Design a protein around this nucleic acid. Structure first.
Ligand code: MG
Ligand code: MG
Ligand code: MG
Ligand code: MG
Ligand code: MG
Ligand code: MG
Ligand code: MG
Ligand code: MG
Ligand code: MG
Ligand code: MG
Ligand code: MG
Ligand code: MG
Ligand code: MG
Ligand code: MG
Ligand code: MG
Ligand code: MG
Ligand code: MG
Ligand code: MG
Ligand code: MG
Ligand code: MG
Ligand code: MG
Ligand code: MG
Ligand code: MG
Ligand code: MG
Ligand code: MG
Ligand code: MG
Ligand code: MG
Ligand code: MG
Ligand code: MG
Ligand code: MG
Ligand code: MG
Ligand code: MG
Ligand code: MG
Ligand code: MG
Ligand code: MG
Ligand code: MG
Ligand code: MG
Ligand code: MG
Ligand code: MG
Ligand code: MG
Ligand code: ZN
Lengths: 37, 141, 130, 184
RNA sequence: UCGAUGUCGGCUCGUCGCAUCCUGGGGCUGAAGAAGGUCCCAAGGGUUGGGCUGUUCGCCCAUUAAAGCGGCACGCGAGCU
RNA sequence: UCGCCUCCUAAAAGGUAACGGAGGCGCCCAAAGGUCCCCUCAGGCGGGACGGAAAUCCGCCGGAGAGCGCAAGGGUAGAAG
RNA sequence: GCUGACUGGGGCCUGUAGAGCACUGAUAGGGCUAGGGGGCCCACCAGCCUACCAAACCCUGUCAAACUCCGAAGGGUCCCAGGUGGAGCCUGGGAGUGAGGGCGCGAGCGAUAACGUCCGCGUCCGAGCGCGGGAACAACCGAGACCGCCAGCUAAGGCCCCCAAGUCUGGGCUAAGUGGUAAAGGAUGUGGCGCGGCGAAGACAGCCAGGAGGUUGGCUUAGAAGCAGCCAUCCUUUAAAGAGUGCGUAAUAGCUCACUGGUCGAGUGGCGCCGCGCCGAAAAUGAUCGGGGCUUAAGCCCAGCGCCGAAGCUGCGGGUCUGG
């Protein structure tokens, strides 16, 4: 769960951010950390 | 799979895919239904893959109503063969679905369940889908 | 304002027998002390001296729809109205006066009362017990 | 249920909707006029009105006449209304669909199965004035096997039916658990 | 293209791609450490000698930071074989 | 595979291709011909000795689904049966 | 010697599109119901039950090139009319051609792949590799080149520079160089419609307090205490607190959120659409939308005035073929 084409939230503490022009998924538990590619 | 038990002709031309749905555009049976948004030949293995997905999601529960039926012969020529020498052999069967057709639809299950249940089956299909529930479908009086 | 309608309607009806309607302090209690405070003049006054709390907003509107302003000394903040329709008014107070001094809280926590119509006071609560 | 209508002379139906309105029609024995209603407004009504309850229309003549949808034609794709048929009620006996309110927990459900509501209506003829609201139905007691239907309902005062009446209106069918694949 | 565009493999000589074998950065790890796994960034430079078969390829021997995968008329015969 | 017949593909006149789709013919009948006169089926449901779920019967109901030598189509009981 | 293509009006001939199951077949579920597993079995005389198999038949949903109860648009033909055209018809002399190709649409084949293949109508190329546009380019858009002109109006396509003509005029959108070309699928990107729900008897966020007793709800080989599958699917003291929203214990413990008190004291969350954009997006010599460059545009969408622009059309002069 890091760089996929389908980025979603997985869990209530996951927030969808968008920086550097890309969509990142930010969260407390390090695993959920995602991007898009 | 799912396929006709008898037939007058084993193979049939390809035909076209223009037009709306001709029929089967309103719920009719269950409480929710999956509607097709694009033209396409849905194959028996796709239908099965979706239905199992359904019965698999809500393990032991509700009733699923498969409304499309693969009765059209899909053909294919032997691997690495040239053009000619007659028509190919039947590889499988398909269901000709056009925009608007309510392919599947569930009953006897919680709304939340109907959703995630129909959503998954959508993924198994080769076209865009839309979930719905009984409304102006009361085509009567 | 559809559920708050019933809330006020109930507060008013209850605000009927205004004999010991008082409001003081000793708050920040737990849920274990819930059944506690809810036992004062209930074990000597019965279903006559109870302690009910509701929206200050809706409460300040009740006193208006049935004369009883003056609650300016005591009004703002999180408050409770120890309603006593029966059972000694000064006695149902000699309870909320002890439990408070017991639950670890100085003798400073009484925001005026209205005994059968009459704006009591602050220090005029430390006497309604003694 | 109040829904307003308006008259139509004879200009491109495609325009009416390309605007925001829903073309339609009114009729019965006498009278039959091309009319229309605001789409977004007619929907909000129909959602509850359906064809089970009487939709009271209006018009410029301030004549609030009672009616009920005879049929609504859809767009197939886009799936939305495209035209409605309003049936103006009179005094004469008329056939309509009265909603079956199946109440109760069938023994077959708690046990094993789903209550497939084969028929959530039943065309019955009656008097406009005397139009039922819902024909209740006794569902408790229905087990996994077959199920009650048609000739098994409490038909209100002056409300018989235009059914078989063998037409099955409901049936409890066992639930689908695990274990599949038959073509080995 | 048949009034001709020489065809496999090797040798020679390179040059490009990146979907990266090593090396360099980094995220997650069922990452204690050390050693791994996986994904993202990154070709600048590297990417061994042999036994067998015409072999490409593979299978072995012995090493290695690694013994990458492809394109260039399956690169390259008016360059060789 | 090569001639002939039926249906489709053939885009509502006719025609229309492919190593397109699916079946037939290379006979037969002296009565299966001509004419005159009569007759009407298949099934469905009853009731029926042997009687399959159709032998032949009887009673309703039944416009043609039966029949017409053989493919298929068209046609047909106000008969071509 | 008016009969031609084409067209108007009549009359029919027809079964494609579409649609629909009445026929032939195919169909999912349900009802009812011959059978057949088989089931209580009083045992031959029937019998009764069956979340299995399952006829025929009815109901709800559909499917067809070789199905049709039905059925267009059109098309065919005849009659009456227009129609003087390098129209037609008859007889004879000379042929060439019998490898076609691309595009559009309707079918087959194919894998609804092919600058593929085979037919049908049409059209271009062929023979218009003559001219304008499309960067270049037989067949895409424009248009049928007799010759001449240092004149004019247009077509497609254009009007910032290359490059002839608006750095034209009003209203919007986009922020990526999208524009300058890929999908499913993602996402608090932007802008615009909706429709509901909450809120000055104080919502939304944040913060403060509570977040309890029924009891660890019953059920499990280990145990399962709100957090593995069910029945009943509820009670209690209540402002309000579930037989529980995640995190977490082996299990308890712990931290939480559902709900409301209270501060604060103006808006705030839900989903359905539409426009344009983001990611998804890796291939081989050196890159680029033709180039330069372009951001209230030199992009996209919608109005408007005006120009440029062919060998098309006018104007002027000339030649030639027919007919009068
Ligand atoms: Mg040469
Ligand atoms: Mg890379
Ligand atoms: Mg380490
Ligand atoms: Mg190389
Ligand atoms: Mg060479
Ligand atoms: Mg024809
Ligand atoms: Mg035709
Ligand atoms: Mg005779
Ligand atoms: Mg004439
Ligand atoms: Mg003519
Ligand atoms: Mg005509
Ligand atoms: Mg047809
Ligand atoms: Mg059709
Ligand atoms: Mg005609
Ligand atoms: Mg000629
Ligand atoms: Mg001649
Ligand atoms: Mg030829
Ligand atoms: Mg050829
Ligand atoms: Mg040829
Ligand atoms: Mg041609
Ligand atoms: Mg040809
Ligand atoms: Mg052609
Ligand atoms: Mg093709
Ligand atoms: Mg070709
Ligand atoms: Mg092609
Ligand atoms: Mg040919
Ligand atoms: Mg030409
Ligand atoms: Mg040209
Ligand atoms: Mg050329
Ligand atoms: Mg050109
Ligand atoms: Mg050009
Ligand atoms: Mg000319
Ligand atoms: Mg001009
Ligand atoms: Mg123009
Ligand atoms: Mg210029
Ligand atoms: Mg894109
Ligand atoms: Mg997309
Ligand atoms: Mg502007
Ligand atoms: Mg000219
Ligand atoms: Mg002249
Ligand atoms: Zn998370």
């Amino acid at each position: 769960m890091k760089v996929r084409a389908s980025v979603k939230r997985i869990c209530d503490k996951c927030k969808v951010i968008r920086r550097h022009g890309r969509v990142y998924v930010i969260c407390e538990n390090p695993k959920h950390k995602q991007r898009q590619g | 799979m799912l396929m006709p038990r008898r037939m007058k002709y084993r193979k049939q031309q390809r035909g076209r895919l223009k037009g709306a749905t001709k029929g089967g555009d309103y719920v009719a049976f269950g409480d929710y239904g999956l509607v097709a948004l694009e033209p396409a030949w849905i194959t028996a293995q796709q239908i099965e893959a979706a239905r199992v997905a359904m019965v698999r999601h809500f393990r032991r529960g509700g009733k699923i109503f498969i409304r499309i039926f693969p009765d059209k012969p899909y053909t294919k020529k032997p691997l690495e063969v040239r053009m000619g020498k007659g028509k190919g052999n039947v590889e499988g069967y398909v269901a000709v679905v056009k925009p608007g057709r309510v392919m599947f639809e569930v009953a006897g299950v919680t709304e939340e369940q109907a959703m995630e249940a129909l959503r998954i089956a959508g993924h198994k299909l080769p076209i865009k889908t839309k979930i719905v529930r009984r409304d102006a479908y009361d085509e009567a009086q | 304002x559809x559920x708050x309608x019933x809330x006020x309607x109930x507060x008013x009806x209850x605000x009927x027998x205004x004999x010991x309607x008082x409001x003081x302090x000793x708050x920040x209690x737990x849920x274990x002390x819930x059944x506690x405070x809810x036992x004062x003049x209930x074990x000597x006054x019965x279903x006559x001296x109870x302690x009910x709390x509701x929206x200050x907003x809706x409460x300040x509107x009740x006193x208006x729809x049935x004369x009883x302003x003056x609650x300016x000394x005591x009004x703002x903040x999180x408050x409770x109205x120890l309603x006593x329709x029966x059972x000694x008014x000064x006695x149902x107070x000699x309870x909320x006066x002890x439990x408070x001094x017991x639950x670890x809280x100085x003798x400073x926590x009484x925001x005026x009362x209205x005994x059968x119509x009459x704006x009591x006071x602050x220090x005029x609560x430390x006497x309604x017990x003694x | 249920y109040r829904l307003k209508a308006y008259y139509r002379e004879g200009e491109k139906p495609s325009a009416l909707r390309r605007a925001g309105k829903l073309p339609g029609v009114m009729y019965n024995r006498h009278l039959n006029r091309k009319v229309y209603v605001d789409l977004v407004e007619f929907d909000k009504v129909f959602r509850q009105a359906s064809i089970h309850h009487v939709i009271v229309l209006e018009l410029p003549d301030g004549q609030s006449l009672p009616t009920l949808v005879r049929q609504v034609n859809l767009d197939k794709r886009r799936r939305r209304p495209e035209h409605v048929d309003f049936f103006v009620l009179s005094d004469e006996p008329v056939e309509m669909y009265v909603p079956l309110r199946f109440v109760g927990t069938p023994a077959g459900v708690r046990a094993g199965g789903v209550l497939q509501e084969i028929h959530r209506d039943i065309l019955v003829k009656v008097s406009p004035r005397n139009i039922p609201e819902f024909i209740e139905v006794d569902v408790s007691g229905l087990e996994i096997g077959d199920s009650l239907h048609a000739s098994d309902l409490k038909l209100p005062p002056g409300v018989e039916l235009a059914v078989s009446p063998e037409e099955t209106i409901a049936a409890v069918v066992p639930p689908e658990d695990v274990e599949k694949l038959a073509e080995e």
